Ligand binder design. Sequence first.
Ligand SMILES: CC(C)[C@@H](NC(=O)[C@H](CS)NC(=O)CCC[C@H](N)C(=O)O)C(=O)O
Ligand SMILES: [Fe+3]
Length: 329
Amino acid sequence: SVSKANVPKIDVSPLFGDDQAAKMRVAQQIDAASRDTGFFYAVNHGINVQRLSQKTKEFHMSITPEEKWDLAIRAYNKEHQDQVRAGYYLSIPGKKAVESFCYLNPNFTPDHPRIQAKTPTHEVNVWPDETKHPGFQDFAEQYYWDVFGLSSALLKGYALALGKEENFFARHFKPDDTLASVVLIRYPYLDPYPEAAIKTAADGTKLSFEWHEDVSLITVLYQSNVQNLQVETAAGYQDIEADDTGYLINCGSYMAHLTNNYYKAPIARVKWVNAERQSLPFFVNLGYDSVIDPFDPREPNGKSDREPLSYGDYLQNGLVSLINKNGQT
Ligand SMILES: CC(C)[C@@H](NC(=O)[C@H](CS)NC(=O)CCC[C@H](N)C(=O)O)C(=O)O
Ligand SMILES: [Fe+3]
């Protein structure tokens, strides 16, 4: 028998305002949730989520094989050596069900010095033909900045929760240099569903994606209304109920590092479900040279002996390790 995770629904709208005590009352709830299962739903968040699923499904349904190859990351097309992160992630019929499209900071252009320097984890986005996908690039770039705004406010909530000034995290989260990414993920309905795309967990649960900590500061996720996620607790894996108006929020391993494990990075997995569904994570990554000084809010003097980690190298390491562990998505 599988239990259900405590995932509180937190009205985050005060984090956009100027009522500081109201922000503290949000921060308290973020602290509580981060110390419990590690997940909460952000509600009253102001993002129009009503068509995100439709647009994601329709883009994947309508993009042709030729277009997928043309946009494909290096793992699927050796001609695209510069596309490590951004671009199309093809399914493999009979073997791999999921397909997805990842894009980065729209401000990463050939003019950007990190592109000029060929710094790892920085790439220029690739986009399909506008006339074949009218409005898609516009929608996607706008969505990036919409979720950027929400994420900056959430980061104020996390900073207050930890006893810091509200810009402790968000001052490192900037449009000119953020390594944050959006992934537009389609999980298809398949009949018959290929068993090779299903992994069996140690506890016997059929899965589409194995256990992992997120590589992020925090993760800001919209999913369509099909229950799939589970979070690991000491009592075992627990189901995360879907909420296809709220945003599912949790800390990544960078936050676990800098708080000296006071806010752990929850371990989650994706159960296999034979259902058309859409999943849109926004990974809140900082700049390549962003460094946050660790602290230990469990200690009277607040001091941590842990090394400040440069975020870019953390991201570099984290993305490769997740591929090595859980497979190329
Ligand atoms: C909701 C999650 C479980 C989602 N999975 C995911 O997004 C998984 C696990 S967090 N994430 C990744 O593979 C990292 C993608 C990083 C991205 N290509 C980039 O370069 O920045 C899913 O639906 O599979
Ligand atoms: Fe994850």
